[PDB]
Amino acid sequence: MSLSPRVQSLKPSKVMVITDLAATLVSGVPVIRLAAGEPDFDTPKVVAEAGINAIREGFTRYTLNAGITELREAICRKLKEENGLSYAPDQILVSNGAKQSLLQAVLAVCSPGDEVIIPAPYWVSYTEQARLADATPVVIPTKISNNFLLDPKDLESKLTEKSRLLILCSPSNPTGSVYPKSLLEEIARIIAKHPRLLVLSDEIYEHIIYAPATHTSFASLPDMYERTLTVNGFSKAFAMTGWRLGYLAGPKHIVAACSKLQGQVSSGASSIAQKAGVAALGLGKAGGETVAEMVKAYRERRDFLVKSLGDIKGVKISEPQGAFYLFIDFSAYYGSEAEGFGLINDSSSLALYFLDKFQVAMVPGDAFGDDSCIRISYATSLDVLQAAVEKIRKALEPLRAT
Amino acid sequence: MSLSPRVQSLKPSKVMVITDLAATLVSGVPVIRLAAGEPDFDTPKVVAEAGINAIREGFTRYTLNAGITELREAICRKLKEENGLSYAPDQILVSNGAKQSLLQAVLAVCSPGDEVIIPAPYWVSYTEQARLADATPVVIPTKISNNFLLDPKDLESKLTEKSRLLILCSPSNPTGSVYPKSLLEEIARIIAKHPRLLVLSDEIYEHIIYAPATHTSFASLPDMYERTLTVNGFSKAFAMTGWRLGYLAGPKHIVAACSKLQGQVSSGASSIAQKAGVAALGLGKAGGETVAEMVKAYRERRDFLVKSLGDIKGVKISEPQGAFYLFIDFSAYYGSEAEGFGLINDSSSLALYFLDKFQVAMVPGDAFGDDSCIRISYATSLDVLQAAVEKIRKALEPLRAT
Numbered sequence: 001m002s003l004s005p006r007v008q009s010l011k012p013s014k015v016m017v018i019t020d021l022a023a024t025l026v027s028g029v030p031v032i033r034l035a036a037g038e039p040d041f042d043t044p045k046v047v048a049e050a051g052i053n054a055i056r057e058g059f060t061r062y063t064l065n066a067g068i069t070e071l072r073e074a075i076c077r078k079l080k081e082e083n084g085l086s087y088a089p090d091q092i093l094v095s096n097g098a099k100q101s102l103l104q105a106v107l108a109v110c111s112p113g114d115e116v117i118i119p120a121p122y123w124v125s126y127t128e129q130a131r132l133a134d135a136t137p138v139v140i141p142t143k144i145s146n147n148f149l150l151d152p153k154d155l156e157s158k159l160t161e162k163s164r165l166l167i168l169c170s171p172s173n174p175t176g177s178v179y180p181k182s183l184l185e186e187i188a189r190i191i192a193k194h195p196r197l198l199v200l201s202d203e204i205y206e207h208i209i210y211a212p213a214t215h216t217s218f219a220s221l222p223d224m225y226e227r228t229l230t231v232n233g234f235s236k237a238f239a240m241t242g243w244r245l246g247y248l249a250g251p252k253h254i255v256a257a258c259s260k261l262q263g264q265v266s267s268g269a270s271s272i273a274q275k276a277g278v279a280a281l282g283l284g285k286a287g288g289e290t291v292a293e294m295v296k297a298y299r300e301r302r303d304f305l306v307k308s309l310g311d312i313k314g315v316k317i318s319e320p321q322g323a324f325y326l327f328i329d330f331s332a333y334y335g336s337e338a339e340g341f342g343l344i345n346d347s348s349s350l351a352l353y354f355l356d357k358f359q360v361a362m363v364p365g366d367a368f369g370d371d372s373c374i375r376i377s378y379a380t381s382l383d384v385l386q387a388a389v390e391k392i393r394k395a396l397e398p399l400r401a402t
Numbered sequence: 403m404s405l406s407p408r409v410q411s412l413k414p415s416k417v418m419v420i421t422d423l424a425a426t427l428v429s430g431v432p433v434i435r436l437a438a439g440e441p442d443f444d445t446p447k448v449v450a451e452a453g454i455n456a457i458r459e460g461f462t463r464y465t466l467n468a469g470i471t472e473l474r475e476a477i478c479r480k481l482k483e484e485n486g487l488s489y490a491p492d493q494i495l496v497s498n499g500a501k502q503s504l505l506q507a508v509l510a511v512c513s514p515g516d517e518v519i520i521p522a523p524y525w526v527s528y529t530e531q532a533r534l535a536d537a538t539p540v541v542i543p544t545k546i547s548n549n550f551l552l553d554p555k556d557l558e559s560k561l562t563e564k565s566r567l568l569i570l571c572s573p574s575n576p577t578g579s580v581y582p583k584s585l586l587e588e589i590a591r592i593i594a595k596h597p598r599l600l601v602l603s604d605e606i607y608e609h610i611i612y613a614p615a616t617h618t619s620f621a622s623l624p625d626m627y628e629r630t631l632t633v634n635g636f637s638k639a640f641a642m643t644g645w646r647l648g649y650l651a652g653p654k655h656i657v658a659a660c661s662k663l664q665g666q667v668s669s670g671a672s673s674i675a676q677k678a679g680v681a682a683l684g685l686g687k688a689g690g691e692t693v694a695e696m697v698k699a700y701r702e703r704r705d706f707l708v709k710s711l712g713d714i715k716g717v718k719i720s721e722p723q724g725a726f727y728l729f730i731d732f733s734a735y736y737g738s739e740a741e742g743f744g745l746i747n748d749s750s751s752l753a754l755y756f757l758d759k760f761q762v763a764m765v766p767g768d769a770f771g772d773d774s775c776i777r778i779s780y781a782t783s784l785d786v787l788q789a790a791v792e793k794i795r796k797a798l799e800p801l802r803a804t
């Protein structure tokens with residue numbers, strides 16, 4: 001009955017657990033679902049059509065494991081036009097989603113004992129992927145008064161000789177924060193003084209961004225091109241959740257080793273999805289009006305929640321600059337009791353209270369390494385969001401702040 | 403410039419290397435391509451249509467990571483109807499292809515130092531996937547006079563306390579051999595006396611089988627259900643190479659741990675591919691007439707090559723019982739010299755000679771752990787095969803046997 005130590009010490013993704021729990025409950029139990037971050041739009045018409053055309057034209061046989069040339073060349077043009085980055089097509093590795101991209105990158109560059117520096121709140125997979133490579137997660141807490149942005153001084157103090165990989169998610173999952181160029185530059189100068197330290201730049205939410213914030217690719221900073229693994233994809237910006245199409249861009253020697261690894265553990269992205277990705281990149285800079293319409297809806301949802309929830313006593317919010325998540329501080333309510341439920345002690349019991357007693361499904365902050373908050377996804381309709389706020393207010397009424 | 407020890411010691415899949423080499427050469431250089439094993443048929447009409455319908459009906463948003471219920475239930479019915487196996491839907495884990503299925507299975511059950519028993523000739527990824535889990539490959543050579551089938555006595559001798567996983571590929575890649583029930587039973591009784599030993603049963607080529615041979619699922623043998631991880635898929639039988647749809651069936655506790663792992667490192671199979679898989683399973687027992695037509699073509703190609711190549715001096719062949727590979731013994735020609743090329747010393751130089759001087763691309767046996775042979779894929783037309791044989795004859799003419 002035994003299992004490997006790597007897998008048995010692995011922690012289930014609470015994002016997926018709660019999501020599937022809410023789905024299954026939706027039996028015949030109506031639950032407001034704000035856990036997993038999945039765009040509530042159809043794949044854009046021309047993208048879907050390219051996928052259909054791929055099938056109809058029999059584009060279902062062997063394709064290059066690393067990705068078809070047509071897609072990798074289109075990805076190089078995107079990186080240059082949108083991010084100012086110069087890559088050759090063999091510096092691109094196309095995978096089945098960004099989760100696989102990140103894993104292969106970590107396995108490729110992290111030796112046993114190496115330290116992976118992960119700012120909190122973090123996306124749930126960063127720590128677990130680190131452990132899978134026999135690497136040691138080095139978590140750096142951030143503060144809500146600082147938009148959950150990394151403080152350079154904290155970075156420096158935690159650097160050792162074993163420091164190998166720094167993970168930079170911008171715009172962030174779960175906080176929605178966007179690293180300004182100013183801060184990236186300071187981090188860069190720190191990185192530059194540590195020959196062994198590489199940077200993983202997770203830019204999947206790049207186009208989900210709200211003015212005046214701007215996205216700055218870390219590979220674009222002075223001396224950082226040689227240090228940076230750029231991870232990006234299609235699912236969030238183009239509503240291609242079921243397609244699964246991610247990619248990695250980076251230094252030749254690293255990308256070549258990830259491609260070798262992928263060749264032994266994966267078949268690569270589907271040929272059908274890759275054709276769809278080509279058409280998605282064909283929509284123009286930043287996905288054009290297609291993606292702009294979607295961003296405009298996200299922005300309207302953001303503003304509704306931020307004003308609605310921020311008014312509430314003992315609720316603290318950082319107005320997000322991108323993505324589609326709110327990382328809300330309800331910690332003031334910890335220590336109080338809700339009749340019929342019990343004590344609200346932390347983010348997990350609070351979320352469980354929201355779910356059991358008010359049928360709203362959110363994800364507790366402890367899954368992202370910050371127990372002071374709970375994450376809401378607002379890739380859902382405005383009416384759902386209105387109903388969710390009404391329930392959150394009612395839920396917090398019998399509780400006590402601080 | 404450094405990389406992890408796991409990845410730098412990883413060996414590139416020569417199957418993919420030669421395949422991409424031949425493709426790229428096909429510039430404007432005509433090469434007979436018989437390396438990678440990819441069906442030369444369109445995805446069946448109703449399967450392709452289900453994929454198109456999935457896209458058109460907007461089935462592109464969140465799906466359960468482990469696989470949609472509809473597909474996992476259909477997979478359970480297949481396993482019962484075709485293989486005599488009883489699984490619950492939560493004993494099925496749907497992945498992006500069988501390569502990922504196998505990796506997660508290995509990472510889940512193999513602790514560092516555990517030994518993975520791999521009969522040779524083997525599929526190229528088994529040893530490398532073992533190393534990725536910090537496990538130790540234990541290769542057992544087989545003999546061509548014995549249809550490259552495992553000898554129980556050799557299995558017993560190599561068993562230690564560190565023995566954790568035995569990998570059984572039937573019908574085999576690369577040899578095309580099919581394990582009879584008789585032999586599986588003897589192996590089973592050996593397995594049964596070693597509490598820690600599990601079995602990975604790779605049955606992806608199950609329906610590509612030529613009478614009188616029959617496929618016997620290892621999980622069906624006495625006391626083996628609790629010991630067996632069954633890996634299967636869609637790409638080979640249903641010509642779904644670009645779809646990427648594999649699955650694992652096994653004991654609940656193991657499958658649950660693989661599902662947890664998959665949740666942190668992958669997004670799972672595309673939603674579009676999963677709908678296509680449902681329709682594929684809907685074709686009936688063994689894929690019905692659809693798959694039967696394809697098997698009939700493979701069988702005709704097998705018979706042509708086996709008679710054509712077997713006549714040639716110093717060429718030894720085992721008539722395959724399934725899959726679509728020939729593992730041909732040219733070793734008699736080793737030690738001879740070909741003017742304009744040089745010495746033919748082993749399977750790699752021989753293959754290189756075929757490729758450079760006669761534009762036929764095959765894969766040397768050393769990639770499968772047996773340097774005495776070279777592998778040919780006959781998932782190509784009869785005319786290509788006829789041309790390949792004509793070139794192989796001409797190539798061997800100036801060489802010397804034994």
Ligand SMILES: O=C(O)CCC(=O)C(=O)O
Pocket residue numbers: 015035036037038099173669
């Ligand atoms: O699974 C993904 O890749 C995106 C969805 C996600 O992880 C999240 O909701 O944070």
Ligand SMILES: O=C(O)CCC(=O)C(=O)O
Pocket residue numbers: 267417437438439440501575
């Ligand atoms: O890559 C696959 O999964 C099947 C093709 C293959 O590996 C082979 O030709 O042996």
